[PDB]
Amino acid sequence: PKETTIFAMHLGKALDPNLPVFVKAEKDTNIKLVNVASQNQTDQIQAYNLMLTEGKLPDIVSYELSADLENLGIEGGLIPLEDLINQHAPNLKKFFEENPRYKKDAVAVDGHIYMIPNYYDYFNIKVSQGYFIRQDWLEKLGLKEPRTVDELYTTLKAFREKDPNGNGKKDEVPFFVRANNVRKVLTSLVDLFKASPIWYEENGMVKYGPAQKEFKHAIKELSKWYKEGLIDEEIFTRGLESRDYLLSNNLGGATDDWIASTSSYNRNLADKIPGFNLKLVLPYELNGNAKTRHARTTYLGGWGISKDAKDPVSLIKYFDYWYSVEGRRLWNFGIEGSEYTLVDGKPVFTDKVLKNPDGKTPLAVLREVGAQYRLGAFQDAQYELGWASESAKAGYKYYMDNDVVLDELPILKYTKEKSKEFVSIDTAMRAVVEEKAQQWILGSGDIDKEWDAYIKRLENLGLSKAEQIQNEAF
């Protein structure tokens, strides 16, 4: 039994090594994880920053912000992994050989690998979020499916004012989102208005979304919709249970969220809310613009081995376990005999996952056992297709066939000084954006009055230099 410290959080939860997935991994690898993040910590960014001041680094450092993680490597906090992989990680060695695009995500500008990313199965499923609306509420109110942002506005107003759930109460929450930080709230609100809360590419150039007039318009509109009760008054505080709560209580009318899990509610709530039909629609058009910037990335976050780890060989073997057939299946599907059984050598989920008696989504059930826990593993789309509804599967194709999805800007990588400065600027600007966007949407500040000063503040923090760094790396 090898006791191994780790910093690991995901979706606001510190990794619990007693979860079934990690107990099995412990048996198979003899690695016993001990988290340095405690169970009452839910802010991964603040926890990571605090962790950096605590002295000795944990053996394994997992983090969702890969640019920060790579900077830690460049500074010597994380060790290079490439020799460790070549000598002791045959599964990872093979994975990088077979997948050059994925290998590119793991290699820093200086040629070292400081982290193993958590890869999506991008070349099998590359869409992410889509727009959903309560078709049964449309039918009840005699309304057509809205196809433009103005029509959405009018439709949401009808949801708010005309009691579509039929209970005589003004309790409807027309548009809602699902998030565990301010960035994710903004992400699922501003795409409506063809804005972006992050960096994006435009004709060969890299631009900062929150500095654009499209973002100003998005926030100004959202402020109006907020005041009129068309978007959830609790958007910034409701947290990751928002969708579960608002749909299961027949309050929510529309959202922007991941296609498979959001599609699971029709079956999930069919008995509880007769006629419930939360239906995928193409992104609403804004003056003819039919595009969404919601796309799956090749990876999200990653983990590395710190300079303070006593036994890195043992740890790279732990990293490698997740790329074995059995280890990858474990990460993706949970435990054989519990979450799935093998049928002709292929995992098929059980009723526990597919027909959960407490209305948990299939993905929610899988996360509860430690499956899909973001570390540095490789997702398998067969897991997603294994619980996705027929409507979800048709939905992927709907979005792809209609060419509405714009690829995400890959995370750019820089040389050491530029990387340190970019992350510093990017982080400082993020704080300003998230402060002002809340103030403006909630009505405590006036965006028309304050926008120019906000832009000057971003510039003061280094927006132009960040723009230059981004475009050199592009």
Ligand X SMILES: CC(=O)N[C@@H]1[C@@H](O[C@@H]2OC(C(=O)O)=C[C@H](O)[C@H]2O)[C@@H](O)[C@@H](CO)O[C@H]1O
DSSP string, 146-209: P-BHHHHHHHHHHHHHS-TT-SSS---EEEE---SSHHHHHHHHHGGGT--SSEEEETTEEEEG
Q: Which of 308, 304, 376 is nearest to 113 (CA)?
A: 304
Which residue type, as a one-letter code, is found at position 259?
I
Q: Which is nearer to ligand X, 209 or 395 (CB)?
A: 395
Q: Which is nearer to ligand X, 251 or 385 (CB)?
A: 385
Name which of ligand X, Ca ion, none residue 161 binds, using a CB cut-off of 5 to 8 Å depending on partner kind: none
Q: Which is nearer to ligand X, 299 or 454 (CB)?
A: 299
Measured CA to CA, the distance from residue 158 to residue 464 in angstroms comes to 43
Which residue type, as a one-letter code, is found at position 206?
V
Stretch of 40-48, 204-212, 317-325, 372-380 contacting ligand X, by CB under 6 A: 372-380
The residue behind tokens 């727009």 is 131
* Phi, psi torsion values for 118, nearest 5 degrees: -90, 105
Name which of Ca ion, ligand X, none residue 300 binds, using a CB cut-off of 5 to 8 Å depending on partner kind: ligand X
Confirm or reject binding of residue 161 to Ca ion (CB under 5 A): no
- Residues annotated within the binding site are 163, 165, 167, 169, 171-172
- Strand boundaries in 264-368, DSSP class E: 278-281, 299-305, 340-343, 346-349
Angle between helices 416-442 and 463-473 in degrees, nearest 10: 130
Site size with ligand X, rule: CB under 6 A: 12
Confirm or reject binding of residue 298 to ligand X (CB under 6 A): no
The residue behind tokens 């949970």 is 334
Q: Which is nearer to ligand X, 78 or 363 (CB)?
A: 363
- Which positions ≥6 away from 169 have C-beta within 8 Å? 163
CB of 129: closest distance to ligand X in angstroms? Answer: 9
DSSP string, 229-276: T-B-TTTTTS-TTHHHHHHHTT-EEEEEEEHHHHHTHHHHTTTTSTT-
Confirm or reject binding of residue 167 to Ca ion (CB under 5 A): yes
The residue behind tokens 């510190």 is 14
Q: Going residue by residue from 387 to 426, which x/- string records binding to ligand X, judged by CB under 6 A?
A: ----------------------------------------
Binding residue (CB under 6 A) for ligand X from 159, 199, 215, 258: 258
Binding residue (CB under 6 A) for ligand X from 260, 315, 423, 441: 260
- Residues annotated within the binding site for Ca(2+) are 163, 165, 167, 169, 171-172
Q: Are 236 and 182 in contact (CB under 8 A)?
A: yes
Binding residue (CB under 6 A) for ligand X from 281, 282, 300, 411: 300
Confirm or reject binding of residue 238 to ligand X (CB under 6 A): no
Stretch of 51-59, 162-170, 371-379, 410-418 contacting ligand X, by CB under 6 A: 371-379
The count of other CB atoms within 10 Å of the CB of residue 76 is 11
Binding to ligand X in span 115-134, by CB under 6 A = 118
Stretch of 163-171, 191-199, 256-264, 423-431 contacting ligand X, by CB under 6 A: 256-264
Stretch of 206-214, 222-230, 257-265, 303-311 contacting ligand X, by CB under 6 A: 257-265
Stretch of 64-72, 149-157, 168-176, 393-401 contacting Ca ion, by CB under 5 A: 168-176
Binding residue (CB under 5 A) for Ca ion from 163, 228, 435, 450: 163
DSSP state of 32: E
Taking the C-alpha atoms of 15, 17, 18 and 22 in order, what is their torsion angle to the nearest 10 degrees?
Answer: 110
The residue behind tokens 């040629």 is 111
Confirm or reject binding of residue 171 to Ca ion (CB under 5 A): yes
Q: What is the token pair recorded at 400? A: 């792809």
Residues near ligand X, by CB under 6 A: 11, 118, 184, 258, 260-261, 300, 363, 372, 374, 379, 384
Binding residues vs Ca ion (CB under 5 A): 163, 165, 167, 169, 171
